[PDB]
Copies of this chain bind each other. A is one copy, B any other.
């Protein structure tokens, strides 16, 4: 038997256990998102710590990030999204970057994953 390493092994939610993602994989989900008519958006932040409170159920700190510009309403091609990512990477090179999606009929997000690490 082998032992799972407990020291310095952070995880970042969805698609963090599968092998690293490539640019082809990246520009494959953006298309799946577009085929179902959803609005993309980008977010950035320099830390990922989680904080709690003494006696308040359902309260956690560190859930909100910072929005890049504005949701890309009326976007029908993927290329544009990839260019905007390179702009964000050039702007702040010491932060995490995330990609989101939005459904206005049930008012809820649909996916999220990380594309850059410090």
Contacts and interface: CB of A to CB of B under 8 A. Distances in A.
B68 A3 contact: yes
Contact of A7 (B1, B6, B70, B92): B92
Interface string A35-76: 000000000001000000010000000000010111000000
Contact of A3 (B3, B6, B54, B69): B69
Contacts of A91: 3
A7 B3 CA distance: 37
Contacts of A69: 1, 3
A85 B74 CA distance: 58
Contacts of A54: 54
Given A1-B69, A1-B70, A3-B69, 6 more contacts: A3-B68, A3-B91, A6-B66, A7-B46, A7-B92, A54-B54
